[PDB]
Amino acid sequence: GAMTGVISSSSIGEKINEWYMYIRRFSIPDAEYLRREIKQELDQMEEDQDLHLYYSLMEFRHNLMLEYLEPLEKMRIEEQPRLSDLLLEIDKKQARLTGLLEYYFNFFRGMYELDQREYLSAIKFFKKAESKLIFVKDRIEKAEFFFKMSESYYYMKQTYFSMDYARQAYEIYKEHEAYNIRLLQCHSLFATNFLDLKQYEDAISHFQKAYSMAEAEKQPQLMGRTLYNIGLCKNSQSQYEDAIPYFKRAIAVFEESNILPSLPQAYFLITQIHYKLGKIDKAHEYHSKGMAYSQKAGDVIYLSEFEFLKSLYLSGPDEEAIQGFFDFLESKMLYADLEDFAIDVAKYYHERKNFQKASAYFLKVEQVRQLIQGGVSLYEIEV
Amino acid sequence: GAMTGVISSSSIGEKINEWYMYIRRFSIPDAEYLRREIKQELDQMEEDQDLHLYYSLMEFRHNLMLEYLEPLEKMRIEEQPRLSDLLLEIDKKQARLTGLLEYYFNFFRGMYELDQREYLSAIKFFKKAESKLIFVKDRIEKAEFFFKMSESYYYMKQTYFSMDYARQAYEIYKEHEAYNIRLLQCHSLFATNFLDLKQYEDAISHFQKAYSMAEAEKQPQLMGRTLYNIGLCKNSQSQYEDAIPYFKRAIAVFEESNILPSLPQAYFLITQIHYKLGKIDKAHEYHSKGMAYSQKAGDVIYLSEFEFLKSLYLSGPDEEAIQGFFDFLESKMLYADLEDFAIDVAKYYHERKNFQKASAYFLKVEQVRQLIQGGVSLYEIEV
Ligand SMILES: OC[C@H]1O[C@@](CO)(O[C@H]2O[C@H](CO)[C@@H](O)[C@H](O)[C@H]2O)[C@@H](O)[C@@H]1O
Ligand SMILES: OC[C@H]1O[C@@](CO)(O[C@H]2O[C@H](CO)[C@@H](O)[C@H](O)[C@H]2O)[C@@H](O)[C@@H]1O
């Protein structure tokens, strides 16, 4: 599907949330342990500054925990206030810090729930985080929220909300300067959602706009992703001849800049396209390179998918290797890839008048669509 | 698809919107006009009183316009205020009322936009409405909002958000006493959403729960819909025999209460099931009754869908009448019906080992899936 992509650490945010839970309970050894463990981790990482802003605040909240406990040392246990009453006091006198921590807590707890594929739960925490945006005074930090809500709702395919949030983030980024990289990213969010709605031309316009902006910013990871995504739009519309140039330009960018993570996917559709077109000559060359990149990075999913291309276009087809591939994708919950591929096989046969085979794979497409793919649980509701 | 609702016109709420436009324009003849005419459309209404409440606050707003304009007939052009100024005076003195008016205004404007298939715009207005909820007094009216949001996002297939709003509505209705009908309707919402997610067991559980409660409230319209929908779930899963008693029970309920407008749908899938089973005698039975109900209710769509059952299972298939039927659904934008039926045709030919023709209708499905069925437009975003 579309190149998005990359950089979760739902791990760390949720660790800071747990640290906060230990802080509110005055679980001192546990709070000290996490205070140390998380620092070490965040130290090997110019990645989110999300996490960094949050860490600082909890650092300060940890120190206030210790300040409020210092008096208790000059006290008989019977004189000392209950810890629940100590906590009520901290929160009273730091209404503002409390609400900003409550913002991040829900935010990162939602991100974690999302990684756990607990969607309704994730939305619940995301809405509670949105309620605490009043505690987020900085406008760019508000826009970051909206931006990551757009990504999140893109992953959940709540297309309309993903675009509404991208438009909220856009409004803010646009009125500052060089938030231009975030702005072009808003463009790819519009584009990727347009694509899911089958609005290919509008997706292409936003991908082109985003490309132009990435070139001006000299952001080659982004230049290549948008190039790739425009070829994808063309490919989905069976406009094979227009797809190829974008796929080639995307490959060149990634390579010239040594972007290894992106290269197995960058090589994949272009390889499929040549098999489809009967240009076996040029297919085998693309198949080998992308095959070689997948080996280097140990891309399990792309190794398996390049092997699929040989099972269909070269090897019979090997219906047996195809079924096991489908079981593999299914077991990995790669349901979109699976449906597309099951169509590819149906279409392969259809075009060769093996209507009985085409048809069995069209029935397989149906069997995948009937699977619970993004299922949900009600929180505390009794039937 | 799943039965639900009753409606609506999305027209009276928009008329009160228009009414308030002239109020803010101080255009008294036009204000006066709609005040009378909306008054007259309301008292002849099976009212959800969104509207009446909205009307009443607007009637007061209309008098505050006639009242603010009193001192004006005592003045000549030069003495009198700018009507821009007069409006800001009225807004600043009536903070609470004005916000409560914005609540309703945005809510009914979003409904109208949804009705115009302007989805992102409908969400933009719905969020404005949600944000004036602070001006909304009472918790049952908050619950009404959430419940209606859940209905709207169900219609927009933003399934997770639809379930999140149903849950928020549920929580309020649950702690209240005489809101059992609302509560069972929340269960139908979880159920219809679970269905879209392929969680059939969860959907049945919640449909069964809402049936149970609808029985207790002696609410036959609800009893029939929930029974039909359980049948629908069995039908979706190809559990055809299991489906029949459910549809029979539903039809018994709709007939007992002369629920004429539900009978065409009620009869539809049970007819199709009998064809599917090769029970042409029973099939011909349900088909004549379902078709007669469609003729009497003036149901244009079912009249045409019963015709298609003839075309497919009796007439050849009559491929040509099937093509004109598909075009008809496509033109009315009935895409879910269209895809299901195209699959029904594929499977019928498949079972008869006409794999070429099966394979051609499997390709129709894929074409229908490629249409822009829910396209969107960005508000004011360049290139
Ligand atoms: O590579 C991980 C990362 O890439 C994305 C696109 O940005 O998905 C691609 O790679 C997957 C294999 O890991 C493919 O299955 C998929 O078809 C392709 O789009 C992201 O979805 C993923 O996080
Ligand atoms: O009666 C219109 C109303 O019924 C619903 C289900 O509650 O849809 C049914 O009727 C449609 C044709 O009018 C069918 O195409 C559809 O398959 C069927 O569920 C509502 O969706 C619709 O607004």
Author numbering:
A (entry chain A), B (entry chain B): -1 to 381
Paper quotes:
In Bacillus, the Rap protein family modulates complex signaling processes mediated by two-component systems, such as competence, sporulation, or biofilm formation, by inhibiting the RR components involved in these pathways. The second subgroup, comprising RapC, RapF, RapG, RapH, and RapK, blocks the action of the target RR by a direct interaction with their DNA binding domain, and works as an anti-activator. For Rap proteins, regulatory peptides are called Phr and their mature active form is a penta- or hexa-peptide generated from a ∼40 amino-acid precursor by means of a post-transcriptional export-import process. As previously disclosed by the crystal RapF structure in complex with the DNA-binding domain of its RR target ComA, RapF was an all-helical protein consisting of two domains: a small N-terminal 3-helix bundle domain (residues 1–68) and a large C-terminal TPR domain (residues 98–370), both connected by a linker region (69–97).
